[PDB]
Design a binder for this molecule. Structure first.
Ligand SMILES: *[C@@H]1O[C@H](CO)[C@@H](O)[C@H](O[C@@H]2O[C@@H](C)[C@@H](O)[C@@H](O)[C@@H]2O)[C@H]1NC(C)=O
Ligand SMILES: *[C@@H]1O[C@H](CO)[C@@H](O)[C@H](O[C@@H]2O[C@@H](C)[C@@H](O)[C@@H](O)[C@@H]2O)[C@H]1NC(C)=O
Ligand SMILES: *[C@@H]1O[C@H](CO)[C@@H](O)[C@H](O[C@@H]2O[C@@H](C)[C@@H](O)[C@@H](O)[C@@H]2O)[C@H]1NC(C)=O
Ligand SMILES: *[C@@H]1O[C@H](CO)[C@@H](O)[C@H](O[C@@H]2O[C@@H](C)[C@@H](O)[C@@H](O)[C@@H]2O)[C@H]1NC(C)=O
Ligand code: AYA
Ligand code: AYA
Ligand code: AYA
Ligand code: AYA
Ligand code: CA
Ligand code: CA
Ligand code: CA
Ligand code: CA
Lengths: 218, 218, 218, 218
């Protein structure tokens, strides 16, 4: 009964792929994609963009329960990300790729979703994130403490709905420096900040080719 | 805590009948009918037609949760079929009988439902099936990759609802070569392909007497 | 982790009262009242009438989930009765008392609720009951094979709703010989068969003072 | 798998903070705040007021499922309080503070919520409380036996809704002597008994600065 992808790795499973994990407060467990290569391996993936094949402009229930496929574009679901990040102290790794085959990454030494929320869904799965390092620059620390906002559930610090306006779903403030669940607009676009944006690397008008968000215990 | 009917058999239960199984991600478990005779035994039944006593023209929730009785005509439910087929690599056995006491079978070396779906219900319990052998001919490989479609939830490649039109529930494309959840029309019928059809054996206008779909780990 | 009140007794708990039980397919478990005196003890109570303090003219959800208190008048809930009676072969004991301090009982060697139902709620928690003995006479064997009917969910063999007409909830045919979830009308009443009726003992116009329905493995 | 904060303490965790507990009939478990200092420690917190940062004028579902954060103002949820208080015999400790830095406490040797309810939600999570001692005086024993009432679900002994009228959620009679889930009105207020009231200490027109309700096995 591994609790995450690091337990899977330490048990002797060295190959990238889909494995069963059993978080402390999710004993039924569920399947995840494990990255067993990045910085020694043991990363549990919870988000991937790579080809714009999956619609990410989804409502609250979809972002709670998850959508897409573990072998392609997917969102694991905030209920699962909560179950994972509350059972130990996790770091976040974000891998990015542009349409010119360029790559960069952001590492956060602390990452959590609704860590102290009695009802994390009610409380809007608030983001805990700290301690940046990497090549992509920081585009997430400004989002620390913000609730998750979708097109049909607004908990941001804007007078309008940030998720509706920037066609995504994120821990929006007023509104964002990152938007990895945005529209797959494929590189440079005329529209403002409504693509797969990581502003610190490629600004507010470049939708990235590939994103992967994953967690490992520190 | 057997995970399926093969575990039940290997534990020393050799009789056909109803047993408790406990899939990896369904730890509460549920009761299934075990076929302990076919090709050495250890088959978990998830579909049976035999007398048209049970209505199979049911909606999404019915095909998710299951209906009928384990000792007669039933559908185990896609949530249970998902839980079973994701915990190991399963083969599918389909037993068929006509109203002239003729029998045939289809064996598939690979069978799965929503194998990599984050939310298999959202994703429409897509069919994985490959490697045919048997006497009935192949009527399922064309359905590989298709989502499950009911009269009240359309995910097929038709401009209309295949489930509504052919009075069934299946991994419809545009529309089908098999329709084992179709109406129990009892043998030859004037209506087109809306019966218990296995086209490769008995064509598109013969509703079979008996069908049984069951799985065993390879 | 006792599965029922017999496990509780055999573990060395000899006192009547409330205990935790953990049925095979209900691993979370729940509290029940255990009768540790009747015919050696080990009986799991699922119904009690004694003072008409609790309303038994309730809808489908109430009879699924249960109502009242374990220490007084209650219905354990059909989901729990299903979980109990499907994990082994149970007998039913029915204790009755009139308002003249007279007592009688009915014993059934076989009792079950939705024993082979894929979805027992969908299938209406059909009654399995056989092999009568006792002093009260038989008022249940005619109900064998019937689905459970409430005022807001009709699955009986009447043109009207038996539960609505006889102000109860039961495995109604057309309509009943027993009605222990009927109105607490307190002894003889002018109204026809809408009280706590056990017809074989006290006929169709006498609402009993006390009823208790309980199960033990054979 | 500690069942409560006393198990956490006895396992060798001596620090105040958030821990995972696994009640008998809530095996998935959940996180709670443990008080490891008060009278030897081992107290499971289920309510805290301290700064009026969280809205406590919430409906039935919120008081069932819980709200706020474990590290600040929160309500653990009646489903969790039921799961905790039914697995053993618990005492209640209530810590109070006024806006003049004055403190007092109420100890109850017996505390429970829906202890014998078949469906504690249906039954309205009725209060069991007895055996007062402390400095704050008794403001809860009059509430013993009363169901929990919210603005959108009335089970009190008033002709109006006590929760609506006194802007809280409590085991209201007609109506209250305590109201710790009332509005955070900050000390003396003109409005009648609609603040964080503990009448025996600070009367019906003083909203307390701090409240903490917590349980430990006797
Ligand atoms: C970017 O990486 C991908 C995957 O490794 C390569 O396919 C790209 O190479 C380009 O496309 C291939 C099919 C071939 O025509 C090659 O000559 C091209 O350079 C690679 N580079 C770019 C610029 O996309
Ligand atoms: C088909 O198989 C069934 C079950 O084994 C048999 O009952 C059928 O036999 C037929 O019906 C029986 C009752 C008897 O009258 C016999 O003489 C018949 O041949 C069997 N054959 C057919 C053609 O249905
Ligand atoms: C029926 O049983 C009950 C419980 O044991 C008894 O209370 C009844 O006794 C009657 O009521 C008591 C209070 C006392 O007045 C006695 O003299 C009565 O006979 C008992 N009998 C009847 C007829 O109810
Ligand atoms: C009440 O307790 C708090 C926390 O210990 C103290 O801060 C209060 O002290 C008062 O405020 C501080 C900042 C300082 O100005 C001190 O001189 C004040 O007395 C303490 N007392 C009161 C009356 O609030
Ligand atoms: C997209 C977004 O939030 N952009 C910032 C810079 C702003 O509008 O103030
Ligand atoms: C039933 C069905 O789909 N029949 C195929 C042959 C078709 O209509 O093209
Ligand atoms: C109450 C009930 O069903 N009575 C039977 C005898 C009948 O009406 O036929
Ligand atoms: C608030 C409350 O219930 N007060 C009591 C004294 C009453 O009104 O009778
Ligand atoms: Ca807003
Ligand atoms: Ca269609
Ligand atoms: Ca009817
Ligand atoms: Ca009222």
């Amino acid at each position: 009964r591994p609790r995450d992808c690091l337990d899977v790795l330490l048990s002797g499973q060295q190959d990238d792929g889909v494995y069963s994990v059993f978080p402390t407060h999710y004993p039924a467990g569920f399947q995840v994609y494990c990255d067993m290569r990045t910085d020694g391996g043991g990363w549990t993936v919870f988000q991937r963009r790579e080809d714009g094949s999956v619609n990410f402009f989804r409502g609250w229930d979809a972002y709670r329960d998850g959508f897409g496929r573990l072998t392609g574009e997917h969102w694991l679901g905030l209920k699962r990300i909560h179950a994972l990040t509350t059972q130990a102290a996790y770091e976040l790794h974000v891998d990015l790729e542009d349409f010119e085959n360029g790559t960069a990454y952001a590492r956060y030494g602390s990452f959590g979703v609704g860590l102290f929320s009695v009802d994390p869904e009610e409380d809007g799965y608030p983001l805990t994130v700290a301690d940046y390092s990497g090549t992509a620059g920081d585009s997430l620390l400004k989002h620390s403490g913000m609730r998750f906002t979708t097109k049909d559930r607004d908990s941001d610090h804007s007078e309008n709905n940030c998720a509706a306006f920037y066609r995504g779903a994120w821990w929006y403030r007023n509104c964002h420096t990152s938007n990895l669940n945005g529209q797959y607009l494929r590189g440079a676009h005329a529209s403002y900040a409504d693509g797969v944006e990581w502003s610190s690397w490629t600004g507010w008008q470049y939708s990235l080719k590939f994103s992967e968000m994953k967690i490992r215990p520190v």
